[PDB]
Amino acid sequence: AGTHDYSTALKDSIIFFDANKCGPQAGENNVFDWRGACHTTDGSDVGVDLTGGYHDAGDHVKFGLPQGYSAAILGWSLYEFKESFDATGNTTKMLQQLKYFTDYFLKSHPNSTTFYYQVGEGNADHTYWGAPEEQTGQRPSLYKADPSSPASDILSETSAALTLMYLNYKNIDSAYATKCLNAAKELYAMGKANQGVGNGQSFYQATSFGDDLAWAATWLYTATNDSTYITDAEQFITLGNTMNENKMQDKWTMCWDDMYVPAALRLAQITGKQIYKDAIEFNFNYWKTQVTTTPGGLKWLSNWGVLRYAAAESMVMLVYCKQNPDQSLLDLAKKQVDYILGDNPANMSYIIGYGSNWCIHPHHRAANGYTYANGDNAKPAKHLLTGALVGGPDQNDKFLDDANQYQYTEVALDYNAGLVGVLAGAIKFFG
Ligand SMILES: OC[C@H]1O[C@@H](O[C@H]2[C@H](O)[C@@H](O)[C@H](O)O[C@@H]2CO)[C@H](O)[C@@H](O)[C@@H]1O
Ligand SMILES: [Ca+2]
Numbered sequence: 001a002g003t004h005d006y007s008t009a010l011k012d013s014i015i016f017f018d019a020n021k022c023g024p025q026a027g028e029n030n031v032f033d034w035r036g037a038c039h040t041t042d043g044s045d046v047g048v049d050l051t052g053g054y055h056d057a058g059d060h061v062k063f064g065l066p067q068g069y070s071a072a073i074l075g076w077s078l079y080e081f082k083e084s085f086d087a088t089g090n091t092t093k094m095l096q097q098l099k100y101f102t103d104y105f106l107k108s109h110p111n112s113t114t115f116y117y118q119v120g121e122g123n124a125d126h127t128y129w130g131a132p133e134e135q136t137g138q139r140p141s142l143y144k145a146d147p148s149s150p151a152s153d154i155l156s157e158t159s160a161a162l163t164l165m166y167l168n169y170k171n172i173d174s175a176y177a178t179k180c181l182n183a184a185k186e187l188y189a190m191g192k193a194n195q196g197v198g199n200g201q202s203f204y205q206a207t208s209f210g211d212d213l214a215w216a217a218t219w220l221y222t223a224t225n226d227s228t229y230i231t232d233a234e235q236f237i238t239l240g241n242t243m244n245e246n247k248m249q250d251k252w253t254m255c256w257d258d259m260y261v262p263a264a265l266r267l268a269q270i271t272g273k274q275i276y277k278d279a280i281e282f283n284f285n286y287w288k289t290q291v292t293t294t295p296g297g298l299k300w301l302s303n304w305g306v307l308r309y310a311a312a313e314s315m316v317m318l319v320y321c322k323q324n325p326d327q328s329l330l331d332l333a334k335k336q337v338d339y340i341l342g343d344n345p346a347n348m349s350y351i352i353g354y355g356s357n358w359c360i361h362p363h364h365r366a367a368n369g370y371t372y373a374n375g376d377n378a379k380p381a382k383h384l385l386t387g388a389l390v391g392g393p394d395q396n397d398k399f400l401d402d403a404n405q406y407q408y409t410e411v412a413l414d415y416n417a418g419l420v421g422v423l424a425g426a427i428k429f430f431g
């Protein structure tokens with residue numbers, strides 16, 4: 001299409017988070033009348049109020065790594081493209097989605113050296129299909145980070161999210177903002193004290209934490225101006241590196257498990273070093289010609305959550321373009337966004353509730369609104385999951401609209417985090 005309504009897409013992408021809110025206040029100021037209080041006793045098994053936060057995807061478990069990553073990317077979006085939110089009247093809602101995240105992180109940090117990061121057990125949770133408001137029983141506070149149990153990546157992403165909130169909220173409620181920064185400082189300290197990836201069962205198996213520590217450290221520098229954080233960052237981003245001169249050539253993109261590119265981007269801005277500019281340029285060059293492109297024009301990184309990847313890489317490029325105007329990057333980013341919005345061989349918006357001909361069988365329990373009963377869960381979702389970015393098509397641009405095909409129909413917090421950011425960027429550069 002010649003013109004695209006990026007403004008409305010942004011509004012919807014932010015609204016999506018309401019669908020996954022968890023806790024007794026889940027229905028407060030929620031745009032979906034079909035969402036209400038749920039899992040209201042989370043944490044009782046350990047004597048700590050762990051209610052709040054968000055259901056991870058189409059399920060109801062609260063996984064620490066993707067929860068932290070999502071809050072950090074949403075915070076980054078508002079920080080870099082604030083004007084996009086102000087001019088479209090979405091700043092208020094955005095700040096509300098962010099605080100729902102941070103309130104949960106603060107409650108999960110009862111003391112300076114403790115952080116609970118997973119509520120629920122994935123295997124058992126997935127055997128259930130119904131409304132989260134009706135899923136009774138005490139959920140286990142399965143994982144916790146402390147001096148003897150490492151979770152550097154989870155702790156760092158959560159830390160980054162809290163620092164970004166301090167930066168985005170200090171002109172509204174400076175007291176709350178500082179509570180976030182204090183917590184961010186402590187979670188970061190925990191992460192570098194005992195180094196190791198956190199636990200996420202078979203669902204979120206982590207492989208790196210040096211990327212996360214560096215990322216969290218750059219934000220702490222921005223907030224405090226204490227250069228010791230940058231000294232940490234430069235050392236952590238090279239942990240485990242076995243390459244020549246510590247060369248960083250990431251053939252992937254920004255995602256819950258890999259934050260080497262965003263970390264490199266910030267270090268490039270803060271230190272001006274060539275090593276980081278090279279890393280960023282390699283990843284951008286790699287996506288330009290090495291990443292598979294479908295006949296329809298979509299950059300296809302892998303089979304699961306393919307659009308989540310395209311949007312995430314595009315957001316990084318747009319942040320980069322603010323100080324480094326690169327038309328090749330603006331063109332690639334715009335094509336991926338417009339593809340998601342409807343410019344594709346399937347002639348469908350990949351954002352539910354936006355555009356036309358969207359996914360009617362989302363793999364989302366609350367929106368589906370049915371049970372496993374007579375396989376009713378196979379019927380078209382009862383409610384409109386406004387703003388949800390679905391997994392996407394195959395490398396042939398074909399989309400299979402079926403709840404059983406998780407690869408195509410599931411949605412998740414990490415999916416939409418990058419979408420909000422890329423849309424905020426599209427508004428700034430393309431109007
Ligand atoms: O882990 C993939 C996917 O599983 C979904 O649950 C499945 C479960 O894996 C399968 O054994 C059972 O037969 O069906 C359920 C429902 O389709 C889960 O809902 C997703 O969150 C998860 O991504
Ligand atoms: Ca990582």
Ligand code: NI
Pocket residue numbers: 001002003004338343
């Ligand atoms: Ni178009």
Ligand SMILES: [Zn+2]
Pocket residue numbers: 021022023038039055060132
């Ligand atoms: Zn819940």
